[PDB]
Design a protein around this nucleic acid. Structure first.
Length: 208
RNA sequence: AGCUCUUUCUCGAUUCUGUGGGUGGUGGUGCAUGGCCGUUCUUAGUUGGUGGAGCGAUUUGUCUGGUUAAUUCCGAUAACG
């Protein structure tokens, strides 16, 4: 980075990452996903580094800020875990959520009453939301997403590594993303702790 | 049957005679046609728009499954309406 400590790692957030198990990562690698891994464990787990997570969070977020009108940075997730997360995301920062089954042809059509035309996309898990990704390259959208350690990289301009096999790893990462964009664009910045909880960005989950 | 012939009046330009031109026909052609009907077919089938996939003829939509008497619905889903 280059800012003094106000765009660099904080002692607090390290604890939150490790409590939510984001550092742990799946038992497979790609030829593009080996530049964020450090090494393997005794176990089949492959340990994502959090330094490498932190830088990628920032320039990803700075691009989300750069649009003049935030009302067309369309977020998407279809897996259950990333549903509750995206809804709070797009409430907090001006965005348009697309929860559940995508319904393809959304941006390709001209005649469709659910037609959209955003600029950016922020997708959870490339290999569950493959339909909008393929469709991104017909309308010249930049793309950002959360990769595991083995998700295919293709139509992903920038990645933000994560564990993302569920748990608290999903909701935590979307919460952190929303923290950063408000520090930069808004006036929420104070470098002293944000009021909003990462708790209500987690999965609803079958209740008591 | 004044049809024809013998016999010899009546009607009065409507006709008659020649040519041209038509008119009529349960004549032919249903393989020149309209209309109507039968059958394929009484089963559940049929199509375009916009978008996607193919150099293209085309295809997807119009479906693995359950369900219904039924392309009848539920559901799933590069298709949507």
């Amino acid at each position: 980075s280059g800012a003094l400590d106000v765009l660099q790692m904080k002692e607090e957030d390290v604890l939150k990452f490790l409590a939510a198990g984001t550092h742990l990562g799946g038992t497979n690698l790609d030829f593009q996903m080996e530049q964020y891994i450090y090494k393997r464990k005794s176990d089949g787990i492959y340990i994502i580094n959090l330094k490498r997570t932190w830088e990628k969070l920032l320039l990803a977020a700075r691009a989300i800020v750069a649009i003049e009108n935030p009302a067309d940075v369309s977020v998407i997730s279809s897996r259950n875990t990333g549903q509750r997360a995206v809804l709070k995301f797009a409430a907090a920062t001006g965005a348009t959520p697309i929860a559940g089954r995508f319904t393809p042809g959304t941006f390709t059509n001209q005649i469709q009453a659910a037609f959209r035309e955003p600029r950016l996309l922020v997708v959870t898990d490339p290999r569950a939301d493959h339909q909008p990704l393929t469709e991104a390259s017909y309308v010249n959208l930049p793309t950002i997403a959360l990769c595991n350690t083995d998700s295919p990289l293709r139509y992903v301009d920038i990645a933000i590594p994560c564990n993302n096999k569920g748990a608290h790893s999903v909701g935590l990462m979307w919460w952190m993303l929303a923290r950063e964009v408000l520090r930069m664009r808004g006036t929420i910045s104070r470098e002293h702790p944000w009021e909003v909880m990462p708790d209500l960005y987690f999965y609803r989950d079958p209740e008591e």
